[PDB]
Amino acid sequence: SNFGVDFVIHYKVPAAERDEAEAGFVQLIRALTTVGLATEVRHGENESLLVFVKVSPDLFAKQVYRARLGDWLHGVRVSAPHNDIAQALQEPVVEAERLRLIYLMITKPHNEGGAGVTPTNAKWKHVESIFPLHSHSFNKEWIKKWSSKYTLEQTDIDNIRDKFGESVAFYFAFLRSYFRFLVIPSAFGFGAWLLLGQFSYLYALLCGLWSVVFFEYWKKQEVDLAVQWGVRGVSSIQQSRPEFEWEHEAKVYPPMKRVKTQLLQIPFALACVVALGALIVTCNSLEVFINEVYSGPQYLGFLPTIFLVIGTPTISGVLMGAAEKLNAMENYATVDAHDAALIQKQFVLNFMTSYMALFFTAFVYIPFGHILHPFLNFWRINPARISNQMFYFTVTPQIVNFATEVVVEEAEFLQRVREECTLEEYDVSGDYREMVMQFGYVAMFSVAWPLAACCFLVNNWVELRSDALKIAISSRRPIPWRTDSIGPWLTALSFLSWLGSITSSAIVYLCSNAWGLLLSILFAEHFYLVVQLAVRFVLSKLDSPGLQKERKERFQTKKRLLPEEMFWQRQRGMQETIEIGRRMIEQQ
Template identity: 30%
Template sequence: MWPRSFQERLRLSRRWQAGSHPPSNDLDPSELVDFVLVFRYPVNPSILPPTNASTGRTVVEDRSDLEQNAIEAYQEVVGRLHKLGLEWYVPTETSSPGKLFLFVTCPDAVLKQWMVHGKVQDWLAGLRGITPADSSDATVNEETHIGLTRGDHSPNSPRHAADAAAMTLDHPLAYLLQSDGQTAQVIPPAERLRLVYHRLTARPEEGGAGLHPDVHPFIETLYPLHNKQFTRHWIKTWGTKWLINHHDLQRIREYLGEEIALYFAFLQFYFLWLLPPAFVGLVWYLQGKTYSAPMALFIVCWSIAFVDMWARRETDIAVYWGTRHLGRVREPQPLFQPDGWSRHPITHELEPYFPLWKRWSRRMVTLPLIMAGSVFLAGVVGFLFALQTLTDEHYSGPGQAYVTYIPMILYSILMAKAGEMYTGLAKRLNNYENYPTRSEYEFHLTQKIFVLSFLINYLALIITAWAYIPFRAQVNHALLQFSSTILQGKIYGDVGDPLKEGRHGELDNGQVALKMSQTPADQLMVNQLFFFVMTGQILSLAQETIIPMATRYGTQWLQRRGTRSRTSAEGATVGSTAHSRSDTTSNSASNSDLHMASDKVAERSNGDNFEAASTESDKDTEEHPDKPTPSSSPVTVPPRLLRRLVKRALREYDLPEYLSYDDYSEMVTQFGFIVLFSVVWPLTPVIALVNNWIELRSDAVKICMNVRRPIPQRAESIGPWLDNLKLLCWMASISNTLLVYQFGTLLAPTPDTQLYGHTHLPTALGALLITEHVFFGVWFFVRTLIQSFPSVADKMLALEDYRQKVGLSRAFSLTSALGSTESGQGDMGGLENVAQEQPGGASLVGHDIPRDDPGFELISSAFKVA
């Protein structure tokens, strides 16, 4: 049976659901559990390294030893869950040899304690939120906060007025507690999952269970389940509107957390700010203007204004969401491995210790490896560029129309593999550097990933503009001389003068023909940029949305077809009672892989989908009640709901994890194409505008259907990606200057400049020196102009400060009138103990775990299989 907290989750989910969706009689299975924890253990004996160097004999571990180790590991895992106060359920339908699924849920009482502790720590760190009073009212009255502090007292009593005034003082529990000690509002799903995940993955010394998949050897993964009611409503709502509003962002924040909501806020803000450059670019394109100095100046100024305005916007959002100064809360990184524990020299608090010199020494080790990986990646890009240039510009032999597609195919294959290898190297090196907090870890990993994105997307364009085109004559000469030696052909044309050779040289040996590149320089840049912008956007949409959906539906179709074929071949028939279906499902799931288990669960539901009704589910419950979990007493759960839950857990187990790095990297890369190379092809902002309108919806579909539900995290900023945007703005002042000078019409064109551009180096350096100073001057002016206007956050904070001052004055006056200064502190009992709570260091293995837990029986049965 399910844990007792099921009734709490049912009530909690209905209350949360009523505030966001129309009332529904069908509960979503994801609202029953918080996380699905996958416990993986070896079943077959493993070959261990030799224990005796002289004999060289290997030790083969016996199955009984493996079974004992698995049982002890499972005992440790459930003991840690039990010590935290969590409850779990092990459905037999999901079991397979070597793998168990634990459905973990957190009781409300335990969650409330964690939330109180977290809010106190946030308050001590300086996080401040805006009270939910009407921001248009600059005065404080008792009724404004009656929803936060109402109790048994009369609203007009002095005691109630004092409590209400005290609650306006940005108290950490102001919105959480009522005067009677009950929860004042339902905790949003994102906040609930964030708190539970933090406790599950935090180190035992910090009050957690230490069950992070990268830390605990028997934990394969843990993930929350999607709420299909919410995701369907989300996709339907966004698919029928042009723009999203703050209510949509608030719902995303409540469901997925501030980090994902902030990404969509950035994407919406970026989409709206693309309207001016898209309009200007379209006008310039229709007029046939490329490499225009006014266009370059406009793009640089626009990029500066966009970055500064977004920095202000994200501050407003952080203040409104109560995540401002989140960096002061040092959230531990689960992968951090301290050398020991020491006391802070000022606060004397016990904290993990890792020497600074050791971290810098590790950075000195990882830096050459990152550089080597970057050089390798640059080499792959250079090879693909050379191959593309050879097929597009020089090859004129048989099958030329098909040969030009070879570099594109190789680019899609090699760059994906090289990028995967580089990302894996970056993550391993980032783990080796051993950062103590989540913010530090993500900052350095983001910078490493940005290097990857920069090389893959911009290096070929940089080589084309400032290496190949200026030295195209020399490259052509060397290519033809080398090819004539290899192919034993004859060069036609004058090879003595590289400039003439660039227009007249040709090689032909009767089979392979090579020619000189005669494409104008400006058109060559347009071709390259068009390839990266258009091909990149299409490939990104296909890889993120179309291919995963097609693969998933195709796999499900093959599984259903395979299930029907196996059933027909074996002559199996579905029994007339739910009892026979249940036994068949349990036996099949215990001796097959997870996909077979999912198929049997689907058969057990009699072909019904997630929204269908089962007429025999009640009979199934009456005839075959489940075993009680070791952590609670029996509670009746509808079998149909259980089947849907198990089926969904198995399906989402096969989905990949969501990483916000990929989406941010895509948007920042697109921003780089706009600010660095829009003068080459003015339609670049137009393409980005259309793509981002689609991206808003395709990313929602991707998160809802193609990846696991993201684990909610808080955020006050887009972090290092903002620094990368500023870096691209500075680089835009350089690239636009060089492109306008090389290929623009400011200087009179000549036949040679049409092929090679203007290549006078002193003139180019002088132009760079002037424009860079102009760039910093414009940036200073724009920033000063923006800061001269008060932001929304400034107004909200000023209003909040005024409310706190008035509330403090009123609280003191009212409590003095009552003759006691302790009446306003009645609701704060126990806070001191919560704030000073120290994590325990006792053993995490529970002492009250009964042996009738289904997990022990499933592990033992796995080793009895021949």
């Protein structure tokens, strides 16, 4: 398969600006060779020069020793790093960390062990992408093995860690845990739909309890995996963004300027929410118009919603592009803060685009449906319709995806690399966002359509292999990054859960018929809070394997790290002391 190539650099050279392009190429070559990297140059499609780079095991051993020293410094590696640059790796050299360290060597600034060739900030305006190569032998075996199973063991996630790093492995572990936890809502939602009719209050409590239990158990599993993979606490390592444009040095950026460009979110968010509300109001007005005076064969009534969801991927993509443009123009020093801000913006936009139609149907039309008269007479109150609407939503994605699916020398290695270079980087945040949106649907609107949980369970089982296929075939190999958790998405999940405990409950009051609505909302929220406290208390006192491992390591370290003068001169010893004590009690 691969010829030992460890990284690939694109370095587009156009027909124009060739004179400085050659200088950039030679400078890149000296910068790469100074670090101690073996390099090769080959053709690429459309005037590109692919550069193949590997490591001299002594230099790599020294670099991994320095990296382990740095990890020990920040507390993410409690055990001793190693003896010396000698053979102490008999601590494996697994491909994920090797590729991450080689990428750091390639892209780190010249100040600290590297030669910065970042393709956006510095004069490296000609390099397009720096990516590792895919292992087809491993990829085909992984795809075949995952498709031949029904449940994935922890060893599969460990192999994903070993090959693609911490972020991809964490996403796959989260998806596996969420899919396994989706069985309970599927089972009891099928039970409620079979027996309890529709809009079951007990179903709302069960869904909220499942949501909080799953959230807390996933936090416990997250810390377990973080201490198992040796990446616990890596979030404290704040790495600077190369594209950070600073002003002075004491690098620093005026916080007031960042606040000023952050305030641009409010007009952007307001414009997006107003446009989306207008679109959804028009769509639902047309829906009630066709459901009022028209003929079907029934199913055609909710067709505007079907069209809205079929068109919503494009609107969501445009909004995500705008959010990314806004995030790029608003400077962030660390990459963690930039990623958190981008995740927050994308989560808000997707929250709007995916839930505002249901929110308008439930808490706007149902309580007072007499506000649609202007639109209704421009073209010219069912309580259960939301259920049907929710059903369409909860099936729209899966069904349309299915529809799409139905519609449908060393020259070979060089051609494979050239084909791979045209692919796009794998963005795990998109998959995280789609899973978070599905969880929000489950915790928010499953009361209307209790069967939604089974459909999402089937979709999750399909996605556990669909995303694997996307990574293996449809995407170039991502850079192995280290993270101790799924990031800020946890917060989003928590938020959804909390507000879910409101919305679903309110639905049960609104679609089954004021002071009663407020009582139901407050009782559901307080039940959610008390079960959150109870589950946190239960899991806190529960013994985790990571805690036992940490305690064993601490015990091993402990095993390895192991007047006044006249008053006091009366009875200077011990014999006189108890002699005088015996006579002393003898006096009484």
